[PDB]
Design a protein around this ligand. Structure first.
Ligand SMILES: Nc1ncnc2c1ncn2[C@@H]1O[C@H](COP(=O)(O)OP(=O)(O)O)[C@@H](O)[C@H]1O
Ligand SMILES: Nc1ncnc2c1ncn2[C@@H]1O[C@H](COP(=O)(O)OP(=O)(O)O)[C@@H](O)[C@H]1O
Ligand SMILES: C[As](C)(=O)[O-]
Ligand SMILES: [Mn+2]
Ligand SMILES: [Mn+2]
Lengths: 235, 235
């Protein structure tokens, strides 16, 4: 079984290396958390376009359940979220988790990898999410696919990737990732199904990891059974 | 990686030990293969009940494609076999492979494991193929499931089993098995998909091995593409 530990201040989980150069070489988590809460406040009070996007975001179907989800993920090692295409699972849930950590002064304690079924999706979704936070990829949002990657920043960040990348990484280790999200599970894929076996081993060794599986269809019982009749949350 | 070698005259792949029972325990392959070709040829002449059954087999849709399938498998590490259910994939293909080896003085060079998606199919199929061969289970055919098994003879034989039984075997290795057949791949299943990954690793280290994937008429592209754009035999 592979090695894992929670996020640390002077560890970059995306480049899997100590941080030795730069401000964060010595910054404290409280400092990092406080810093990033303030940078959200500022980006709002300067980018006028951003307030309209957040407004378009409040309107999506999944927003009703922001609390049910955070709570369920926070209390359970594995959680299934399911619901029809168009609710906002893909583009919003990662953000709900991130923002929940930023607002409650916990931004240092959060990094999220999210898998997608295809190269296109890993990239377009990373762009989209960066766009919804008024950024370009590279800051709070990155991606990594075969041959091409714009890694996000070291802290309080989300990296989208193909399953291939994430499997290749699970060899070295996923030190410092707090959340792994497998999106579009309903789409049959071999490596993805294999990824679930590895992730299931990881959870057994490391209860404090958070796994979220996300389906567009009702056929979730196969996965629910595989992860010890874990919670299903409707959206 | 998993250990593997071709079948050897002294080795029983099913009990994973040296052969200490039956005829020609210590003989050469050339000798074992003659014996078995003779034993089959004779059985045909004497069992008139078996001759009715062979005519019944002759009419199955899959019969037509016998040569095409054998040629495809002999020339490729992996093959996929696709066809309407009822067609004869499950009950015949293993026999076509066995009988090709027996008939061309190679009986000793053939041992076939076949996975099924349910314990009951493993057994029911094993028992049916034994019947289409005028035998009880335990000679050219057997099975192995969690808690019960009737193992077949060590040479020129087929064992049916569950995906789990095989995954456990692959931990210790599958030395002496010439063909691995995964049946009913269209039935999505996590462990079955895990198996395919592992089998892909085997094929890379051991191109001499044969993998045969069997499917109802669905979109097999995903499999074809996982196994290096391998053939697809339409049936
Ligand atoms: N790249 C995009 N461009 C414009 N609108 C988008 C884009 N991605 C998502 N959206 C909007 O946000 C909605 C949510 O999609 P998504 O987050 O993928 O939800 P789900 O995962 O539940 O299908 C879409 O229905 C669409 O209206
Ligand atoms: N246990 C059995 N008893 C009698 N006939 C059988 C039995 N199993 C299979 N058959 C016959 O052989 C045919 C093919 O079975 P099978 O090899 O499972 O086809 P496939 O795998 O292509 O769906 C069936 O349509 C049936 O007529
Ligand atoms: C019972 As008989 C003659 O088919 O082996
Ligand atoms: Mn989605
Ligand atoms: Mn079948």
């Amino acid at each position: 079984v592979v090695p894992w530990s929670p996020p640390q201040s002077n560890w970059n989980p995306w480049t899997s290396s100590n941080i030795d150069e730069g401000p964060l070489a010595f910054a404290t988590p409280e400092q990092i958390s406080m810093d990033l809460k303030n940078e959200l406040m500022y980006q709002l009070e300067q980018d006028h376009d951003l307030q309209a996007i957040l407004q378009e975001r409040e309107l999506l179907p999944v927003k009703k359940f922001e609390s049910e989800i955070l709570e369920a993920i926070s209390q359970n090692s594995v959680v299934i979220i399911r619901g029809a295409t168009g609710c906002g699972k893909t583009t919003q849930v990662p953000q709900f988790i991130l923002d929940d950590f930023i607002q409650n002064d916990r931004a240092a304690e959060c990094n999220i990898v999210v898998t997608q079924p295809r190269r296109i999706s890993a990239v377009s979704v990373a762009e989209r999410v960066a766009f919804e936070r008024g950024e370009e990829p590279g800051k709070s949002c990155g991606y990594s696919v075969r041959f091409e990657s714009i890694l996000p920043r070291p802290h309080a960040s989300i990296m989208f990737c193909t399953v291939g990348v994430l499997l290749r990484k699970l060899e070295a280790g996923i030190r410092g990732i707090s959340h792994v999200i497998v999106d579009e599970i309903h789409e049959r894929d071999i490596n993805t199904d294999f990824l679930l076996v590895v992730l299931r081993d990881v959870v057994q060794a490391y209860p404090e990891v958070r796994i979220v599986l996300m389906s567009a269809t009702i056929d979730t019982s196969m996965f629910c059974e595989y992860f010890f009749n874990c919670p299903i949350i409707e959206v």
